[PDB]
Design a protein around this ligand. Structure first.
Ligand SMILES: CN(C)[C@@H]1C(O)=C(C(N)=O)C(=O)[C@@]2(O)C(O)=C3C(=O)c4c(O)cccc4[C@@](C)(O)[C@H]3C[C@@H]12
Ligand SMILES: [K+]
Ligand SMILES: [K+]
Ligand SMILES: [K+]
Ligand SMILES: [K+]
Ligand SMILES: [K+]
Ligand SMILES: [K+]
Ligand SMILES: [K+]
Ligand SMILES: [K+]
Ligand SMILES: [K+]
Ligand SMILES: [K+]
Ligand SMILES: [K+]
Ligand SMILES: [K+]
Ligand SMILES: [K+]
Ligand SMILES: [K+]
Ligand SMILES: [K+]
Ligand SMILES: [K+]
Ligand SMILES: [K+]
Ligand SMILES: [K+]
Ligand SMILES: [K+]
Ligand SMILES: [K+]
Ligand SMILES: [Mg+2]
Ligand SMILES: [Mg+2]
Ligand SMILES: [Mg+2]
Ligand SMILES: [Mg+2]
Ligand SMILES: [Mg+2]
Ligand SMILES: [Mg+2]
Ligand SMILES: [Mg+2]
Ligand SMILES: [Mg+2]
Ligand SMILES: [Mg+2]
Ligand SMILES: [Mg+2]
Ligand SMILES: [Mg+2]
Ligand SMILES: [Mg+2]
Ligand SMILES: [Mg+2]
Ligand SMILES: [Mg+2]
Ligand SMILES: [Mg+2]
Ligand SMILES: [Mg+2]
Ligand SMILES: [Mg+2]
Ligand SMILES: [Mg+2]
Ligand SMILES: [Mg+2]
Ligand SMILES: [Mg+2]
Ligand SMILES: [Mg+2]
Ligand SMILES: [Mg+2]
Ligand SMILES: [Mg+2]
Ligand SMILES: [Mg+2]
Ligand SMILES: [Mg+2]
Ligand SMILES: [Mg+2]
Ligand SMILES: [Mg+2]
Ligand SMILES: [Mg+2]
Ligand SMILES: [Mg+2]
Ligand SMILES: [Mg+2]
Ligand SMILES: [Mg+2]
Ligand SMILES: [Mg+2]
Ligand SMILES: [Mg+2]
Ligand SMILES: [Mg+2]
Ligand SMILES: [Mg+2]
Ligand SMILES: [Mg+2]
Ligand SMILES: [Mg+2]
Ligand SMILES: [Mg+2]
Ligand SMILES: [Mg+2]
Ligand SMILES: [Mg+2]
Ligand SMILES: [Mg+2]
Ligand SMILES: [Mg+2]
Ligand SMILES: [Mg+2]
Ligand SMILES: [Mg+2]
Ligand SMILES: [Mg+2]
Ligand SMILES: [Mg+2]
Ligand SMILES: [Mg+2]
Ligand SMILES: [Mg+2]
Ligand SMILES: [Mg+2]
Ligand SMILES: [Mg+2]
Ligand SMILES: [Mg+2]
Ligand SMILES: [Mg+2]
Ligand SMILES: [Mg+2]
Ligand SMILES: [Mg+2]
Ligand SMILES: [Mg+2]
Lengths: 129, 114
RNA sequence: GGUAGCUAAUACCGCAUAACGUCGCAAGACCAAAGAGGGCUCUUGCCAUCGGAUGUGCCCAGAUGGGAUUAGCUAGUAGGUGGGGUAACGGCUCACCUAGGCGACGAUCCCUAGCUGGUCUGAGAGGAUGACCAGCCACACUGGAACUGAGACACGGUCCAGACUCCUACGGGAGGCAGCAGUGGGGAAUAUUGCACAAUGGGCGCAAGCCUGAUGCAGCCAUGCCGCGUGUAUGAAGAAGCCCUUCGGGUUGUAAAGUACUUUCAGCGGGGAGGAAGGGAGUAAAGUUAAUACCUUUGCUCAUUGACGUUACCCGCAGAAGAAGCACCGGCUAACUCCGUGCCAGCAGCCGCGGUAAUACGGAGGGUGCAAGCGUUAAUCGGAAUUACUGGGCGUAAAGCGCACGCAGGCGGUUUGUUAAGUCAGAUGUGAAAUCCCCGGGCUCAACCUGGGAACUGCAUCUGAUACUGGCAAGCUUGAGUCUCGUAGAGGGGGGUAGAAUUCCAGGUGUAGCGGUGAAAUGCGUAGAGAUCUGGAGGAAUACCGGUGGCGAAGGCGGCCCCCUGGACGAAGACUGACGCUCAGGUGCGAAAGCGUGGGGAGCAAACAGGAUUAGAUACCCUGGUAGUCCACGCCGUAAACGAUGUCGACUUGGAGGUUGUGCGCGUGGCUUCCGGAGCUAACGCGUUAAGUCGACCGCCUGGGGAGUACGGCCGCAAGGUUAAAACUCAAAUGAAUUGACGGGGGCCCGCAGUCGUCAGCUCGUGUUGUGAAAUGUUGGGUUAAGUCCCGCAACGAGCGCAACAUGACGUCAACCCGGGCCUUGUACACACCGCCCGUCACACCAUGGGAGUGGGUUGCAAAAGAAGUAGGUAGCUUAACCUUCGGGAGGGCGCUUACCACUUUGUGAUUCAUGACUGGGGUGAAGUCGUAACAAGGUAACCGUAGGGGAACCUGCGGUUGGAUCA
RNA sequence: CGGCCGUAACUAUAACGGUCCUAAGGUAGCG
């Protein structure tokens, strides 16, 4: 059964980029939208939008630069079978700072850089580069 | 292996008894043929050690002085072309004499300096 | 030791006193003490109570080895009430009451073990480890016990017992180095029967001081770490002597000598810190005080205290004098020659080296690396991502349970609220010192010593945050499920029935053969077979349809009809509201063979018999033929039970089919087959039915063997299944693919069918393909005597051959039959089929299973036993302190007795170790014997399970698999 | 429900072979 919707979102992006899809759609959730917001603000995806009400669908517009997909890697870190939490000092650097780690903190989902500047740890959702 | 599986279930010289040498008494002294592709009369001896283990030991160098009831110091070291020979005799220790007329690698054959 | 007498106290005992003490609700009641010293005064001690500090006892949580081939354990056991007990809570103890308590988050049992700070290794995470130094614990000849005491159940105390050993007048007595030194013993291996309390600390003492094997030092040992020396400069004669040499020379080697010098360290002789603070003397003033006393304190001055020690260190003397070795030089790996040897002698970490020109053995010359050390062995981590948390795998290399259901467990769609367990933030406390690290400081430097910091990643508590996870509450419909209508199907169970055929029986016709094979023979037949026709009996299986077809969880399921019954799928809604996924253990299903009981038995056919074949033929072939194959019921629980591919979910270009629904040629579902894209893969290949990209959960792997074996457990009627090691042994085993060669594989051709061979081959450059060995070209369609020529073609060209003008390509042999060419295919071959290779048997050695038994260790259970001690009781005996009416009394002691309990004894189990006639296989070891099972279609395709048979590999039956060649 | 003789790279033994004969030469197990 479906036991990790976030890993599914990341995979839809990974597989979408590898297949040169313009957009990818999926069942929405508040956490998926929170992650989509971070990906947009850091410039990994172009745009997102939620459509529906009873069964909302999240669409992500993927971005390509010089033919190549911009999301070169995207990996689930914390997962249902093994949750991963880090203190502020132990927050991971992705690609020596050139990538992002998405972190769920008590002040919402944000990048590792924003968590570190806010002085927060949290759950490491995924690495993006 | 999954994390849950690991949580449930996590990941040649025996007669010396982890000593550098052992003393022993020669119970038989003989020659034996090496395995293929080698040919020689290789000088060995069965040795009962002070800990009660009986083992075959190799006698190295050119010419030896060991009988039955000779008291020798063995060390680790197999002889590749004698299966089941896992120990060497120390030359120039206890009864076992130094090799006669050696001039190079003298300290390996118990030979005092000319 | 005993007896009698005598004597002191800070020994001992009342009495008095008695409250911020004890008991008590209160009223009350009750409890202590010691003096000594200096000259009344000071100092010190004594008692009580409440505090401090320190030490110690006790409780809780988490953490701290291995084993399930230990799953149940527990009766003071778990809790309660009350009495007792302790410094103190407490089953600590006892009586009674309740029937609890512990355990898969591993109790109980077994094995190993002192724990920690740290230490070694490692980039880290880990792994290994706990010697020295410091914290904690435990023990003191062995077992037990208490006494004294603030503290002990006491290392150099007591008592008892035991095992030892020693003194004795034989009656009895004595002892405990795991203090320091030392001895014997064990061992590969670990030091002097030293000096001193001078320093630091400890005991006692007002102090002086005494004691202190703590400690400070010295001795021994290259055991380690660190520092220094063993000369320095010059010096061609390129001396001899080496060694090598194409005899030119080269190299050692400026090396030596010779000549200038230097003198650390060692030796010898002279000077000289520091570790010494203090303590002792009278004097100085002030404070206590009747006092300018004694005492206290601080100053004051004078002597004096060092085990180390002939100290560190300094100065002087003499002279290169007294001081260099060890390993290595085939690759890995820094360093090469000659001589000796000739698969010998020997080397070896691994691969290997040695059979007459050995950089590998042994010596030498030269060289390389380390250096007062160097090597070797042992041991740990590393490299090893080779147990993979960080950080691995499972189609074919080792690895997906045969398939399913499912409890525990893990995981969990979406929204809101709440909570704040996880998580996060901050603060506080703690995290000993040493060690590590950083910046400094001190020994001439270094090692070493040392100041401050950082660190100690942790733990706890408090206060906050609320995204995510969890809890709780309320929902939602998208996952999952229910209902309605219909569809296809060898899905299952039961019963019936049909037609074809085989065999048999009866009878007719008919007459000499039939049957069988490579060829035969056995066999059947004139007692009439075989053939043919008619009638009958009986069993088993269902031609065609039929299909990479369908159904089933898998195993599996096939004529037709009925009865009972399971699942799947589609359409259109409605309904429930996360009800889900996975699943250790558990449970069920599970081909064929096999087993049990009862039936059945046509055909087929293990075994078996005969006939052949063959060197033999326990086979293949032939003629027969029993179990079995069939049915009922029960068991077995395994297969190459395979897609060699676990289940569930999501996502990611295409093409061509099959099958089965359904909506309007065009859609849309389910199941299924082939090809192929990205991607993935060692490659082969896989490729929306993934071996791609992800998530959840499970199963499984960790070199080849030994071995899926032994032992133990469980299961089974048995056969056996299941769980599952170790010693030992090798440096490989293995997968995929490549070039050859080879095939009793295929296709196509050729030849009277030195060498192969006058065969038509063999190669290269550049380009391209492949991770790569390699490939392409050179293959293909034709044609030729010919890689001859033409045409096509990721190849484009070129060379040697052919041809042309006897001529022998590159190389090989360390010279239907035969030979050869081209393409393709299988291969376990590469010494290339004259290949490789299997098992019994024989011999040697090694480890090991079973085994009548034999000898120990540990331990359960049931009893016996009862030293000493402590406690309880007490007819007897006895008595310093208190009381007394002087008779005694209270209280005590002894003895006796009871309880608990050590030694020890007996019986009976368990477990473990050692050993054992004999017996089973296993492993290793150039060239043994018997065959030839496997690899090619391996000459009968191979293999899996099972059964039977056989000297051995194996053979045969039944079902299964392709991991089988062949088809022109 | 059998004789005879030979045969393994140390011996020893004989998995093996030959030979003769039988209706068939005693299997498993046990000794
Ligand atoms: C100690 N431990 C529990 C061992 C273990 O883990 C085993 C295992 N399969 O994992 C055992 O089999 C193990 O439990 C076990 O049973 C062992 C043995 O049975 C034997 C036997 O019977 C004979 C010789 C050697 C062994 C052994 C060394 O393999 C034993 C090892 C045992
Ligand atoms: K050799
Ligand atoms: K108790
Ligand atoms: K109680
Ligand atoms: K540790
Ligand atoms: K003891
Ligand atoms: K005391
Ligand atoms: K002292
Ligand atoms: K891992
Ligand atoms: K929450
Ligand atoms: K479950
Ligand atoms: K039959
Ligand atoms: K390839
Ligand atoms: K599983
Ligand atoms: K092994
Ligand atoms: K080429
Ligand atoms: K061929
Ligand atoms: K044996
Ligand atoms: K035994
Ligand atoms: K065969
Ligand atoms: K078989
Ligand atoms: Mg007193
Ligand atoms: Mg009183
Ligand atoms: Mg085990
Ligand atoms: Mg076992
Ligand atoms: Mg009580
Ligand atoms: Mg308690
Ligand atoms: Mg111990
Ligand atoms: Mg590492
Ligand atoms: Mg210790
Ligand atoms: Mg430990
Ligand atoms: Mg006391
Ligand atoms: Mg004592
Ligand atoms: Mg003592
Ligand atoms: Mg001692
Ligand atoms: Mg000894
Ligand atoms: Mg003394
Ligand atoms: Mg080199
Ligand atoms: Mg030579
Ligand atoms: Mg080692
Ligand atoms: Mg490792
Ligand atoms: Mg691996
Ligand atoms: Mg295989
Ligand atoms: Mg395999
Ligand atoms: Mg399977
Ligand atoms: Mg299931
Ligand atoms: Mg959730
Ligand atoms: Mg919290
Ligand atoms: Mg510390
Ligand atoms: Mg919540
Ligand atoms: Mg049906
Ligand atoms: Mg039936
Ligand atoms: Mg059957
Ligand atoms: Mg039967
Ligand atoms: Mg037949
Ligand atoms: Mg037959
Ligand atoms: Mg199996
Ligand atoms: Mg099958
Ligand atoms: Mg199949
Ligand atoms: Mg399998
Ligand atoms: Mg199907
Ligand atoms: Mg494909
Ligand atoms: Mg077995
Ligand atoms: Mg078993
Ligand atoms: Mg060619
Ligand atoms: Mg040509
Ligand atoms: Mg061509
Ligand atoms: Mg010519
Ligand atoms: Mg040709
Ligand atoms: Mg045995
Ligand atoms: Mg008694
Ligand atoms: Mg064969
Ligand atoms: Mg065959
Ligand atoms: Mg085959
Ligand atoms: Mg088997
Ligand atoms: Mg047979």
């Amino acid at each position: 059964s479906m036991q990790d919707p976030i890993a599914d979102m990341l995979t839809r992006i990974r597989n979408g980029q590898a297949a040169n899809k313009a957009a990818v759609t999926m069942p929405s959730s508040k956490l998926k939208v929170a992650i989509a917001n971070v990906l947009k603000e850091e410039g990994f995806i172009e745009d997102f939008k939620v459509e529906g009400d009873t069964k909302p669908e999240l669409e992500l517009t993927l971005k390509y630069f010089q033919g190549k997909a911009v999301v070169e890697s995207i990996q689930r870190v914390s997962r249902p079978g093994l949750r991963i939490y880090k203190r502020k000092d132990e927050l991971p650097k992705v690609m020596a700072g050139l990538g992002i780690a998405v972190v769920s903190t008590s002040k919402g989902v944000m990048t590792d850089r924003a968590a570190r500047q806010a002085g927060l740890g949290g759950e490491i959702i995924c690495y993006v580069a | 292996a999954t994390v849950n599986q690991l949580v449930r279930k996590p990941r040649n010289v025996p007669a010396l008894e982890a000593c550098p040498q052992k003393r022993g008494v020669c119970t038989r002294v003989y020659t034996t043929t090496p395995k293929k592709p080698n040919s020689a009369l290789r000088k060995v001896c069965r040795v009962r050690l002070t800990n009660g283990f009986e083992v075959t030991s190799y006698i190295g160098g050119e010419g030896h002085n060991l009988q039955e009831h000779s008291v020798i110091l063995i060390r680790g070291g197999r002889v590749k072309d004698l299966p089941g020979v896992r120990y060497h005799t120390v030359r120039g220790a206890l009864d076992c004499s130094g090799v006669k007329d050696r001039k190079q690698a003298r300290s390996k054959y118990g030979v005092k300096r000319p």
